[PDB]
Amino acid sequence: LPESFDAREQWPNCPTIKEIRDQGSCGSCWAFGAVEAISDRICIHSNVNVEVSAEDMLTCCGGECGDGCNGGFPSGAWNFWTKKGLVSGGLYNSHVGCRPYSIPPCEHHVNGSRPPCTGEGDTPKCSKTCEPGYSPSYKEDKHFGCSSYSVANNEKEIMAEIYKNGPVEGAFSVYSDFLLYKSGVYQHVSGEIMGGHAIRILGWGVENGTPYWLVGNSWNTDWGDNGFFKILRGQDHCGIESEIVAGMPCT
Ligand SMILES: *[C@]1(C(=O)N[C@H](C(=O)N2CCC[C@H]2C(=O)O)[C@@H](C)CC)O[C@@H]1C(=O)NCc1ccccc1
């Protein structure tokens, strides 16, 4: 395997790989990390661009995925994709796809022109219809996954999975010092635990002798390094390697 790897560079025809979303004031990271990677993989394994709806995942999976804006299970999300499939849907107010995200973007632990995130948000309703003007119908717009699996807590296997099939979803323990991340390779040295956080891992590299994972957060682009961040790789730091999940799109 190469010393470095950036899925954004390796798959130039898949722009979703370089985009950063905003989960808004909702604990829907579990759903965002999933639909983002799923969007990436649909493009990688059927070369077609599709913004997989975070709204559909967040609102219709139900208990199988946890508790909506209160948190969920990443592996459950990929299961839903293979069971019920997912329709398309873009950013809030974008009017793109069957079900665009309905929760407003906000400032995540940074100042900006948007309203500060309030963290407290209810899970929107599971509506099985598309936005007015869009076609086809909700049922006709479903994209199915044909496999949902968990990648072992093994650095090399996680790299091989990414290298071959594209970005995966992972999770780690977020501590207060991570909220102020700007650049470099993140390493937890202090701060109270804020909770678990699911994200999208799209690569890896080495910075000043420090190995890292290339990750895309869902707190908009004005957070961290244009929305992305780097985190220590190889020592299951904060559990970054303890919960990798992925899957393959049908055909
Ligand atoms: C994932 C999540 O969304 N995390 C939360 C979060 O990032 N925010 C809440 C308000 C907007 C945003 C922000 O902080 O700017 C918080 C708790 C992290 C600091 O609680 C969500 C989840 O799915 N957790 C369960 C879980 C299950 C398995 C592995 C990891 C996490």
- Residue ranges of domains in the chain: 1-251
Tokens in use for 165? Answer: 């099939």
Tokens 């950013």 locate to 91
DSSP SS3 for 247? strand
For the Cβ of 14 lying below 6 angstroms from any atom of ligand 1, the answer is no
CATH assignment, 1-251: 3.90.70.10
Which of 65, 69, 79, 197 is catalytic? The answer is: 197
The ligand 1 atom at the shortest distance from the C-alpha of residue 32 is 3
CA distances from 62 to 59, 67, 71, 79 (A): 7, 7, 11, 12
Distance, in Å, from the CA atom of 220 to the CA atom of 189, rounded to the nearest integer, reads: 24
Resolution for this PDB entry, in angstroms:
2.5
Q: Is-catalytic flag, 29?
A: yes
Angle value at C-alpha 219, between 218 and 222, nearest 5 degrees = 125
201/58 Cα distance (integer angstroms): 20
Tell me if residue 100 falls in helix, strand or coil: coil
